[PDB]
Design an enzyme around this catalytic site. Structure first.
Site, PDB file in Angstrom:
ATOM      1  N   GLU A  56       0.934  -1.154  -0.039  1.00 28.61           N
ATOM      2  CA  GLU A  56      -0.103  -0.048   0.099  1.00 28.61           C
ATOM      3  C   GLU A  56       0.871   1.343   0.101  1.00 28.61           C
ATOM      4  O   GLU A  56       0.549   2.276  -0.694  1.00 28.61           O
ATOM      5  CB  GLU A  56      -1.113  -0.002   1.349  1.00 28.61           C
ATOM      6  CG  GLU A  56      -1.933  -0.874   1.229  1.00 28.61           C
ATOM      7  CD  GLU A  56      -2.945  -0.994   2.557  1.00 28.61           C
ATOM      8  OE1 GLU A  56      -2.965   0.347   2.820  1.00 28.61           O
ATOM      9  OE2 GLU A  56      -3.742  -1.941   2.707  1.00 28.61           O
ATOM     10  N   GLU A  66       2.096  11.456  -8.845  1.00 26.86           N
ATOM     11  CA  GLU A  66       1.385  11.995  -9.688  1.00 26.86           C
ATOM     12  C   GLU A  66       1.175  13.314  -9.534  1.00 26.86           C
ATOM     13  O   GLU A  66       0.244  13.762  -8.782  1.00 26.86           O
ATOM     14  CB  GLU A  66       0.047  11.099  -9.957  1.00 26.86           C
ATOM     15  CG  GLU A  66       0.548   9.917 -10.720  1.00 26.86           C
ATOM     16  CD  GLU A  66       1.080  10.190 -12.187  1.00 26.86           C
ATOM     17  OE1 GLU A  66       0.711  11.138 -12.745  1.00 26.86           O
ATOM     18  OE2 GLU A  66       1.735   9.220 -12.505  1.00 26.86           O
ATOM     19  N   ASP A 107      -8.860   0.538  -0.341  1.00 28.92           N
ATOM     20  CA  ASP A 107      -7.852   0.838   0.007  1.00 28.92           C
ATOM     21  C   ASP A 107      -7.328   2.366  -0.173  1.00 28.92           C
ATOM     22  O   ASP A 107      -6.875   3.030   0.430  1.00 28.92           O
ATOM     23  CB  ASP A 107      -6.487   0.074  -0.589  1.00 28.92           C
ATOM     24  CG  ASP A 107      -6.412  -1.261   0.163  1.00 28.92           C
ATOM     25  OD1 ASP A 107      -7.160  -1.459   1.306  1.00 28.92           O
ATOM     26  OD2 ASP A 107      -5.969  -2.342  -0.109  1.00 28.92           O
ATOM     27  N   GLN A 123      -7.946  -1.007  -4.971  1.00 34.09           N
ATOM     28  CA  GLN A 123      -7.727  -2.173  -3.961  1.00 34.09           C
ATOM     29  C   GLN A 123      -6.374  -2.755  -3.968  1.00 34.09           C
ATOM     30  O   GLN A 123      -6.001  -3.082  -5.204  1.00 34.09           O
ATOM     31  CB  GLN A 123      -8.789  -3.006  -4.034  1.00 34.09           C
ATOM     32  CG  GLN A 123      -8.572  -4.294  -3.211  1.00 34.09           C
ATOM     33  CD  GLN A 123      -8.394  -3.738  -1.703  1.00 34.09           C
ATOM     34  OE1 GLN A 123      -7.316  -4.486  -0.815  1.00 34.09           O
ATOM     35  NE2 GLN A 123      -9.518  -3.258  -1.318  1.00 34.09           N
ATOM     36  N   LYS A 125      -3.561  -5.600  -3.151  1.00 36.00           N
ATOM     37  CA  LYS A 125      -3.734  -7.051  -2.708  1.00 36.00           C
ATOM     38  C   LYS A 125      -2.533  -7.673  -3.306  1.00 36.00           C
ATOM     39  O   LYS A 125      -2.119  -7.500  -4.800  1.00 36.00           O
ATOM     40  CB  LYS A 125      -4.959  -7.767  -2.937  1.00 36.00           C
ATOM     41  CG  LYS A 125      -5.917  -7.488  -1.863  1.00 36.00           C
ATOM     42  CD  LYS A 125      -7.195  -8.424  -2.122  1.00 36.00           C
ATOM     43  CE  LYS A 125      -8.095  -8.180  -0.931  1.00 36.00           C
ATOM     44  NZ  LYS A 125      -7.648  -8.531   0.392  1.00 36.00           N
TER      45      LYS A 125
END
Ligand code: CL
Ligand code: MG
Ligand code: MG
EC number: 3.1.21.-
Length: 260
Positions: A56, A66, A107, A123, A125
């Site tokens: 994350e 960005e 997330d 998300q 993962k």
């Protein structure tokens, strides 16, 4: 994780507001397993964000980099009424813990200024997690939720991590310093000036030069910058090795201990 008391967390404002006023639904205190958590500052939001894994963190850093990203609202809660409805319509057991249905969260919910879409969700993962049936079910619930709202959603895994970004993280996070002393932050303004004038110079050279100039032991300044960077007070070109960064690639902030 959370009992029926969730109602109070909802009252705390968890999941509401934005920028510096946004409060994540999950915080670093809610970190499971060996999974390391991170509290990094953001120039865009002016606040410290809670990331629950290195993966994350890697995504957050990409977001903060960005130019088009305006806001990053991590651990964003999905409306329970919507998720129960989706669980029902799909025949998937809505997340439950001891009979209490849990509040799901994406997330990252991010806003943009000129990208293809003004808003999108993410998300995070690890690729291996997709080999588990229950995870997939939960992911479908989440996917449908955003689909219902016509907000692009995506899954980011470890194989989406740029190798350079990966090594930069490995250098910045072998836990060196986390002491955000008012004295460490004091170095921000001075450092900003030096880096601004020595703009086109390599960051490492400038670091040695400063060590000499002020008679500090070789590596002192690099250690300071490494700490301020790892904490988010200094941003750099993550797609280039830190060592190959020019001073102009770094961006320093005006943050003072008023981070409560
Ligand atoms: Cl993860
Ligand atoms: Mg999550
Ligand atoms: Mg996740």
């Amino acid at each position: 994780f959370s009992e029926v008391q969730i109602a109070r967390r909802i009252k705390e404002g968890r999941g509401q507001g934005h920028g510096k006023d946004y409060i994540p639904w999950l915080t670093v205190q809610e970190v499971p397993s060996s999974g390391r958590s991170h509290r990094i500052y953001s120039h865009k939001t002016g606040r410290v964000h809670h990331l629950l894994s290195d993966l994350e963190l890697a995504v957050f850093l990409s977001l903060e980099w960005e130019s088009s990203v305006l806001d990053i609202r991590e651990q964003f809660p999905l409306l329970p009424s919507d998720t129960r409805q989706i669980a029902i319509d799909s025949g998937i057991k809505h997340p439950v813990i001891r009979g209490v249905d849990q509040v799901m969260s994406t997330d990252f919910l991010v806003d943009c200024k000129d990208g293809p879409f003004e808003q999108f969700a993410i998300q995070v993962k690890p690729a291996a997690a997709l080999q588990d049936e229950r995870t997939l079910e939960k992911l479908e619930l989440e996917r449908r939720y955003w689909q219902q709202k016509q907000i692009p959603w995506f899954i980011f895994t470890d194989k989406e991590i740029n190798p350079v970004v990966k090594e930069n993280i490995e250098w910045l996070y072998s836990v060196k310093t986390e002491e955000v002393s008012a004295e460490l932050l004091a170095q921000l303004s001075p450092l900003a000036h030096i880096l601004q004038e020595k703009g086109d110079e390599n960051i490492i050279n400038v670091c040695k030069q400063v060590d000499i100039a002020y008679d500090l032991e070789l590596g002192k300044t690099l250690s300071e910058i490494r700490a301020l960077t790892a904490n988010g007070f200094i941003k750099f070109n993550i797609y280039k090795s830190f060592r190959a960064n020019k001073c102009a690639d770094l961006c320093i902030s005006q943050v003072v201990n008023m981070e409560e």
